Amino acid sequence: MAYHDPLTGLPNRRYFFELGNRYLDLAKREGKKVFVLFVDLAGFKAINDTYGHLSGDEVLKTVSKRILDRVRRSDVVARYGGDEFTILLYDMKEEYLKSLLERILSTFREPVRVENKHLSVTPNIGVARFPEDGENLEELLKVADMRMYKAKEMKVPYFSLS
Amino acid sequence: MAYHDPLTGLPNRRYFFELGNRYLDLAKREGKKVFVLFVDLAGFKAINDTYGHLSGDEVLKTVSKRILDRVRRSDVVARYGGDEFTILLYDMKEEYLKSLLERILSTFREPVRVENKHLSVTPNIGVARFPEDGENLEELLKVADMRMYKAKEMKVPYFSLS
Ligand SMILES: Nc1nc2c(ncn2[C@@H]2O[C@@H]3COP(=O)(O)O[C@H]4[C@@H](O)[C@H](n5cnc6c(=O)[nH]c(N)nc65)O[C@@H]4COP(=O)(O)O[C@H]3[C@H]2O)c(=O)[nH]1
Ligand SMILES: Nc1nc2c(ncn2[C@@H]2O[C@@H]3COP(=O)(O)O[C@H]4[C@@H](O)[C@H](n5cnc6c(=O)[nH]c(N)nc65)O[C@@H]4COP(=O)(O)O[C@H]3[C@H]2O)c(=O)[nH]1
Ligand SMILES: Nc1nc2c(ncn2[C@@H]2O[C@@H]3COP(=O)(O)O[C@H]4[C@@H](O)[C@H](n5cnc6c(=O)[nH]c(N)nc65)O[C@@H]4COP(=O)(O)O[C@H]3[C@H]2O)c(=O)[nH]1
Ligand SMILES: Nc1nc2c(ncn2[C@@H]2O[C@@H]3COP(=O)(O)O[C@H]4[C@@H](O)[C@H](n5cnc6c(=O)[nH]c(N)nc65)O[C@@H]4COP(=O)(O)O[C@H]3[C@H]2O)c(=O)[nH]1
C-alpha cells in the first residue's frame, strides 16, 4: 500500500516516513544531499474559525496543488498534520537553499479565492539537511520542526541554522 | 501509508507500484538506469500441495530474507504474488547484468530446511530496463513478466533480450 490524503491529494504522514526513509537510504548510497522542510501555515486556525472547515479545506487544496507545481515530481510533498506540510528535496545544494525557499515562500503566500473572498496564509519554514542534521527521517523532522518553530518566534519566514 | 507483506516482511504489490514509479521519476531526473526483475518460483505449488501452506510459507520467509541481504537496502524487493517477486535495482549497469543475476539465482536456488525435508524452489527471471523497455513501472513489469515466461519456456534461468 501507499496512501495519499484525499483532500489535498498529497502523500500522507505514514507514506512520507516510508518514502522518506527510502530516499535517505538511496542518498547514502549516491553521495547526495537531502533537505527536509517543515511548513506551518499561520492564518489557518483563523480561516476555519471564521468561515468553517470547508473554507479551510479549499485553502489547503489550492496551497497543496501550488506547492506540488513548484517542486520536482521526484521530490516528496506531504500533508503532515492538519495544516503542516513536510517536503523532501532529493539532491539539494546548500548554496541554493535561500533561492529555493523564496520560490516555496512566494507560492504559499499567494491568496486563495474562497466563496468570492481572497484569503491568505502565512508560512514559517524549518530546514534540516541530510547528513548534517541526522541519519534517519525521524531525526531530520524533529530538527526541521524545532527550526520551523524558531522561525515563527523570530517572525522570519524561514530558519535553517545549526 | 506504505504496507509490507507480514509473512515475508517485504514491501507488498501496491507499495512496489508507488515506490517503483517514484524511483523511475527520480532516475529520469538523475540520468540513471533502473532494471526491473520479475522472479517466478517454480516448485512452490508442489510444496504446499505435498506439505501444506505452512511449509510453503517457511520456504517464502527464508527465500525473501536471503534475497533481501544480497541486494542493496536502497533497491526494492517486493512480494508481487503468492510465489512471484519483483525487484527494482536503481542505478544498474547493462554490463554487470549477467553477474548480478547469478548472485540472485544462486540465492533463490539455496534449499530451505523445514522438518528435515530439503525444500528447493527453482527461479525463472525476466529482466526489463529503464529507459529502453518503457516510461512507467506498469510497462516495465509487463515486459519483465513476458521475458520471465520466455525464460521459463527455455533451458536458461533468465531472459533479458529485446
Ligand atoms: N529554478 C529551479 N526550478 C526548479 C528546479 N527543479 C524543479 N524546478 C521547478 O519545479 C517544477 C516541476 O519540476 P519537474 O516535475 O521536475 O518537471 C520538470 C523536469 O522533468 C523537466 N526539466 C526542466 N529542466 C530540467 C532540468 O534542468 N533537469 C532535468 N533533469 N529536468 C528538467 O521539465 C519539467 C518542467 O519544468 P518547469 O516547468 O520549469 O517546472 C519546474 C520548476 O518550476 C530547479 O532545479 N531550479
Ligand atoms: N531537490 C531539489 N533541488 C533543487 C530544486 N531547485 C533547485 N534545487 C537545487 O539547487 C541547485 C541549483 O538550482 P538553480 O540555481 O535553480 O539552478 C538550476 C536551474 O538553473 C536549472 N534547472 C534545473 N531544473 C530545472 C527545472 O526543472 N526547471 C527550470 N525552469 N530550471 C531548472 O539547472 C540548474 C542546476 O540544477 P541541479 O544541478 O539539479 O542543481 C540544483 C539543485 O541541486 C528543487 O526544486 N528540488
Ligand atoms: N558485488 C556487488 N555486491 C553488491 C553490490 N551492491 C550491493 N551488493 C550486495 O548487497 C548487500 C547489501 O548492500 P547495502 O544494503 O547497500 O549495504 C552496504 C552498504 O551500505 C555498504 N557498502 C559496501 N560497499 C559499498 C559500496 O561500494 N558503495 C557504497 N555506497 N556502499 C557500500 O556496506 C553495506 C553492506 O554491504 P555487503 O556486506 O557487501 O552486502 C551487500 C552485497 O552483498 C554491488 O554493486 N556489487
Ligand atoms: N541497484 C543495484 N545495482 C547493482 C547491484 N550490484 C551491482 N550493481 C550495478 O553493477 C555495477 C558493477 O557491480 P560489480 O562488478 O560487483 O562492482 C561493484 C562492487 O565490486 C563494489 N561494490 C559496490 N557495492 C558493494 C557492496 O554493497 N558490497 C560489496 N562488497 N561491494 C560492493 O563496487 C563496484 C562498482 O560499484 P557501482 O558503481 O555501484 O556499479 C555497480 C552497479 O551499477 C545491486 O545489488 N543493486
Author numbering:
A (entry chain A), B (entry chain B): 87 to 248
Study authors write:
We expressed and crystallized a domain of the TM1788 protein from Thermotoga maritima (248 residues, WP_010865403) spanning residues 82–248, hereafter named tDGC. C-di-GMP synthesis from two separate GTP molecules requires dimerization of two active GGDEF domains, with the loops bearing the GGDEF motifs of each monomer brought in close proximity to initiate the cyclization reaction.
To investigate if c-di-GMP binding at the I-site causes conformational changes at the A-site, the structures of the active-like and inactive dimer were compared. The backbone and side-chain conformations are closely similar, suggesting the absence of signal propagation between the A- and I-sites, upon c-di-GMP binding.
